[PDB]
Design a protein around this motif. Structure first.
Motif: not given
Ligand SMILES: *[C@H](C[C@@H](N)CCC(=O)O)c1c(COP(=O)(O)O)cnc(C)c1O
Ligand SMILES: *[C@H](C[C@@H](N)CCC(=O)O)c1c(COP(=O)(O)O)cnc(C)c1O
Lengths: 396, 396
Positions: A65, B13, B34, B102-104, B107, B130, B178, B211, B213-214, B243, B245-246, B254
């Motif tokens: 990020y 963070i 993160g 992104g996932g964000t 959302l 989160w 989640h 959500d 993300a994983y 997402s 991202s991960k 993103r």
């Protein structure tokens, strides 16, 4: 929950493009396009961008990020483009920049920041403007009011009407200015007009919001920022939403910036902390690829030189098409004054045709402009100019 | 306008990371990270991603804007991952997917869509979750209420408490789930628990928001979607914010998706038109590079195979560290049960340590966890495990 949702209004962009695709006539011509096209009718990746992308592929070792405000070098290069190297705004650390997903993302981050952290309730937008301005500000809960701008009779800036309109703006309202290459008219204030507006804004207590999406497409990088810099010299506070979509040909990588300016470093840092909160709650942090390309180019002498010449090439081709359009209309017997097209700046102009003439051009000649009038002169080429102009003369 | 703005709360963070950088001790250890890290403490670009990026560099001929909902192939591949190839949801065209930053971004697009086009006023989020969930939903004007989730005594899912909590949810409220690898606990419902929740959601009139993300970090791509698919089989309507991202290591590009599901094609298309309006007024259209990488990989047999093995490698290294952590704590004399760490899924777990123990670990031993307790087991390595565990035993 969804059974009663009212459909959004039909997408006019999608849209016009769909009608054009389905049109089985040639030579159909699309002037309703929203991007630059070269003389071959393509929107290539810039060579400077390809070279930068190769460097990134070779040297990137992580996709970890970015910070909420993005790549620091991108921010520094952005502020130098906006304010000039050695600017007092930069020396005094009065500006903070967040890398955003396009100019649009910068406008929305600005809007969310203002809605949540200030007393702002209203944004003044030119009549006409890019239609998405109202959508962005309304989405953040802000009212949009229009100010007079376009003189439809003379195809010029109606400066007296503009000033009169904005007298209704209250202290603490936001006023939106296009930095250069006004969209859709291509009509920009002169430097003296900019200076007059800057002084008036200070006196009336407006917060200036600059939309700066076309730096380099009017006269040049520094010249195109004259207006913004006249405001910056006069104001404690302003916001700039800038875009690199057009001047780097990076549209789909979503590369822009939201620059916040306040009276001093303490104040802008405090305010920027809330701008970062508004970003975090939206898309978290910004997309690296496009902005990294821009930072890589702007911070390297060789790549920057190639990019500046590519941008000059775009600017010059646009001006050549404006000139060729006016000359060819005259030669095809239009017999009326289109010289305003040469004076206007950037990709977009109003042609001075009516909505019915635009419809007729589409239906009878396969010539496509935005229904409300915007023509993109980069959709013109030496090869399509004669039939284009013959069609226009035919509907006059 | 900005002189009186209250600063945002200090970025925890930024933040924890700053404290860790400044720490001149080794062997300091950062478990407050993160992102995934490999056995060398790096977050590399995946090889599948590098190969895809090379293909894009070689074959891209324009950066022209994507559509508002992004790359069509990206959408199709996303729905197959979510629902399974041959799903009735896909066959019946009940789902529409927008590529998002992104996932964000997914959302927030979901939140803006719901706030503006439905009667939704409230989103139920697990305690804990989160922290950015509340920020995202609040930004759209939605209230956030918490439901019980974590049993701090047994380090398990407090299922009775969860159900009791959610009895207070009204018909038409949104409930956030989640999909797998709950953040921050790593505690997921069993399939039978998911099925119970799916039935309850239908009876109570909740709108499920997943959500996701994983996917791939718990047991596998298909297994990790079992819960979502149990809900999808039971509901006319739901939303998934996913997402990449991960699971592609594409954090800073993103790459995510907002998938809208309704009872039939007409309804989801109508509703999706307003989801596209919410995107247009935010960041206009989504960033191409990361999503193009994902579409390129998922739609190619060779690249997909390499990527699936890289994801398996991440999943397995995480499970190996969970096992090694529990074994080493026992060997270093912790003398209490940490077996819950082996049962939990994904990068994150609560250690069962108090906030003061976490502070002590930072101050006296240079071991960094999130203050509120989240540890990232991918910050553990065979090389740092012994000193890590010695420090933990010392604060027990
Ligand atoms: C760009 C005008 C484009 N977007 C026309 C096509 C369309 O409407 O979709 C523009 C922007 C947006 O820039 P970004 O693509 O970087 O978000 C913002 N302001 C103005 C005045 C524009 O012309
Ligand atoms: C990812 C958790 C990350 N973001 C931890 C670092 C941080 O908080 O900044 C996550 C997301 C966000 O995914 P995107 O980066 O693609 O937007 C969404 N939901 C959950 C549960 C996450 O763990």
């Amino acid at each position: 929950m969804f059974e009663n949702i009212t459909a959004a209004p039909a997408d006019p962009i999608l849209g016009l493009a769909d009608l054009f695709r389905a049109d089985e006539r040639p030579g159909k011509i699309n002037l309703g396009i929203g991007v630059y096209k070269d003389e071959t009718g393509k929107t290539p990746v810039l060579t400077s961008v390809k070279k930068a992308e190769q460097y990134l592929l070779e040297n990137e070792t992580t996709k970890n990020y970015l910070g909420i405000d993005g790549i620091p070098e991108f921010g520094r290069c952005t502020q130098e483009l906006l304010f000039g190297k050695g600017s007092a705004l930069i020396n005094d650390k009065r500006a903070r920049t967040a890398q955003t997903p396009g100019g649009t993302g910068a406008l929305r981050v600005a809007a969310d920041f203002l809605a949540k952290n200030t007393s702002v309730k209203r944004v003044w937008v030119s009549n006409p403007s890019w239609p998405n301005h109202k959508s962005v500000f309304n989405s953040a809960g802000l009212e949009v009011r229009e100010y007079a701008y376009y003189d439809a009779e003379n195809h010029t800036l109606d400066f007296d009407a503009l000033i009169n309109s904005l007298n209704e703006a209250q202290a603490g309202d936001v006023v939106l200015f296009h930095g250069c290459c006004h969209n859709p008219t291509g009509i920009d204030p002169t430097l003296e007009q900019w200076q007059t507006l800057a002084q008036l804004s200070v006196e009336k207590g407006w917060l200036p919001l600059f939309d700066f999406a076309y730096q380099g497409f009017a006269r040049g990088l520094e010249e195109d920022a004259e207006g913004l810099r006249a405001f910056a010299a006069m104001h404690k506070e302003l916001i700039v939403a800038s875009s690199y979509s057009k001047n780097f040909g990076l549209y789909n990588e979503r590369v822009g910036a939201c620059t916040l300016v306040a009276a001093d470093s303490e104040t802008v840092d405090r305010a920027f902390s809330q701008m970062k909160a508004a970003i975090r709650a939206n898309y978290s942090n910004p997309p690296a690829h496009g902005a990294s390309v821009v930072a890589t180019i702007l911070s390297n002498d060789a790549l920057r030189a190639i990019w500046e010449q590519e941008l000059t090439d775009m600017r010059q081709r646009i001006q050549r098409m404006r000139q060729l359009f006016v000359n060819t209309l005259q030669e095809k017997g239009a017999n009326r004054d289109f010289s305003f097209i040469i004076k206007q700046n950037g990709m977009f102009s109003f042609s001075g045709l009516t909505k019915e003439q635009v419809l007729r051009l589409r239906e009878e000649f396969g010539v496509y402009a935005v229904a409300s009038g915007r023509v993109n002169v980069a959709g013109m080429t030496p090869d399509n100019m004669a039939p284009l102009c013959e069609a226009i003369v035919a509907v006059l």
